[PDB]
RNA sequence: GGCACUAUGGGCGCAGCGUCAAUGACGCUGACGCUACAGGCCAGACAAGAAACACUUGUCUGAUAUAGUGCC
């Protein structure tokens, strides 16, 4: 577990823009096996983006990016490298680097993968999120428990923290994931559930914090009565 | 002409112990060329077969894969609750290389019904101009259930989404929320606002509910 | 395209030349000879090389692969 891959360079482009994202082995050196890129649409299964074999340089890639996309590694930075250009939407995953195992060892497994960056393609822009509460209600609770929640709305791209009470309070709780809707902003809310007893003997504040517009809001979470 | 790995069951519900078997099966030959991973929300795929029937490392004995011509399995002999997750077959035989489109393995629980928390908007979101309306349904199993939107009695539709959680790590149940969506026209133009819940766990649907401002 | 004929591997001499120094080396060129050993040349399969292709190496199977000279 001294093999390590470490990828970076996502974020967020443009249709028709470009990015390129890098994989950084630790480990082991990269000249001695072949690296695969294999992306993950939110919500969606692996799929299969390209790779480059070693000794060969050889370099092999989906239908679906096939000339858009070009796989290489710098074998004196011991690091891979995907050169994504004229991204359509569609290209909007989490992509992976992985190690191909050695023929001997773990056939044609892949053994080690990356960690994961973000890419998205939007023509939308960056955006804060609006946070309102969901006030607890009259609090009738014939169970002695009552809901209350943040609605964090608007918001673009993903994706958003949310803690409660700055980490603490962490029973209970439920964050949703977020939906896209209609405007192309998405939208989640998160709720946790607490004897209705403290309810107002303790005050309950969610932190949302949207490091992709750089908002770091905090809402405090209450009912208004007469 | 790319090989087609399709994979089934797409999702599964069993219990701790149960044997499982995830089949896929390559459209062409794909040799023993062929991998299985184990992936759990928002980590990595890890390696757990090799060359169709090998154990990668730190596999534990109760998994195993087998070929039979172009029918690939993997099989939990004994299923143990680390073993919840998502699970891809791969052919490594041609390029381009193809992934099944996974299965999805989740825990088997008694039945439990949800309790429902209906949320009007805020003063705040009303100074925005639009209004959003959130029902809350709680630990809740199994997945199934229907949220219905009335206004005034008058069922709604298109102008709600939802999104559910993954099962809980301390009881295995749900949650989901729906919110309605309208122009601040709209809600202050009708009364009362309903949110009809239909579940297994529930002998009658459980309505919860509120009319404007009710301080 | 077919058909013949020949030539094709290592060494070892023989000449002739180059190639660098400028005095020796070093090369090629020779259907130029010398020998017993053999191997080259080409295609396929398989194995290993940090190895899916490519590259290198090895084994196995087929004979192939070049030329040149005739004949059709």
């Known amino acids: 577990s001294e093999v390590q891959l470490v990828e970076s360079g996502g974020g967020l482009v443009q249709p028709g823009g470009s990015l390129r994202l890098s994989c950084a082995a630790s480990?082991?050196?990269?000249?001695?096996?072949?690296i695969h890129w294999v992306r993950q649409a939110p919500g969606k299964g692996l799929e299969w983006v390209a790779s480059?074999?070693?000794?060969?340089?050889?370099?092999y890639y989906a239908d679906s990016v096939k000339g858009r996309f070009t796989i290489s590694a710098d074998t004196s930075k011991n690091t891979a490298y995907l050169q994504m250009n004229s991204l359509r939407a569609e290209d909007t995953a989490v992509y992976y680097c992985?190690?191909?195992?050695?023929?001997?060892?773990?056939?044609?497994?892949?053994?080690?993968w990356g960690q994961g960056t973000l890419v998205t393609v939007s023509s939308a822009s960056t955006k804060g999120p609006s946070v309102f509460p969901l006030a607890p209600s009259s609090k009738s609770t014939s169970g002695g428990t009552a809901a209350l929640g943040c609605l964090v709305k608007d918001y673009f791209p993903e994706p958003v923290t949310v803690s409660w009470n700055s980490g603490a309070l962490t029973s209970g709780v439920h964050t949703f994931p977020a939906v896209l809707q209609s405007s192309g902003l998405y939208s989640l809310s998160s709720v946790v559930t607490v004897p209705s007893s403290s309810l107002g003997t303790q005050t309950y504040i969610c932190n949302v914090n949207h490091k992709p517009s750089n908002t770091k809001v905090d809402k405090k979470v209450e009912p208004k009565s007469c | 002409s790319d090989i087609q790995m399709t994979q089934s069951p797409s999702s599964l519900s069993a219990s701790v112990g149960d044997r499982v078997t995830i089949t896929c099966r390559a459209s062409?030959?794909?040799?023993?060329?062929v991998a299985w991973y184990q992936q759990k929300p928002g980590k990595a795929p890890k390696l757990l077969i090799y060359?169709?029937?090998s154990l990668y490392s730190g596999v534990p004995s109760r998994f195993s894969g087998s070929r039979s011509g172009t029918d690939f399995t993997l099989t939990i002999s004994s299923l143990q609750p680390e073993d919840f997750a998502t699970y891809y077959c791969?052919?490594?035989?041609?390029?381009?290389?193809?992934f099944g489109q996974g299965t999805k393995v989740e825990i088997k629980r008694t039945v439990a019904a949800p309790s429902v928390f209906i949320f009007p908007p805020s003063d705040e979101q009303l100074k925005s101009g639009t209004a959003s309306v959130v029902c809350l349904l709680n630990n809740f199993y199994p997945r199934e259930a229907k949220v219905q939107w009335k206004v005034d009695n008058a069922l709604q539709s298109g102008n709600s989404q939802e999104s559910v959680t993954e099962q809980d790590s301390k009881d295995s149940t749900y949650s989901l929320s729906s919110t309605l969506t309208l122009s601040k026209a709209d809600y202050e133009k009708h009364k009362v606002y309903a949110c009809e819940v239909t579940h297994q766990g529930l002998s009658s649907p459980v309505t919860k509910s509120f009319n404007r401002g009710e301080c």
């Open positions: 992985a190690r191909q195992g050695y023929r001997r060892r773990s056939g044609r497994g892949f053994d080690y």
């Open positions: 480990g082991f050196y990269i000249s001695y096996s072949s």
């Open positions: 480059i074999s070693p000794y060969s340089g050889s370099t």
């Open positions: 062409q030959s794909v040799s023993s060329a």
């Open positions: 060359s169709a029937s």
């Open positions: 791969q052919q490594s035989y041609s390029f381009p290389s193809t």
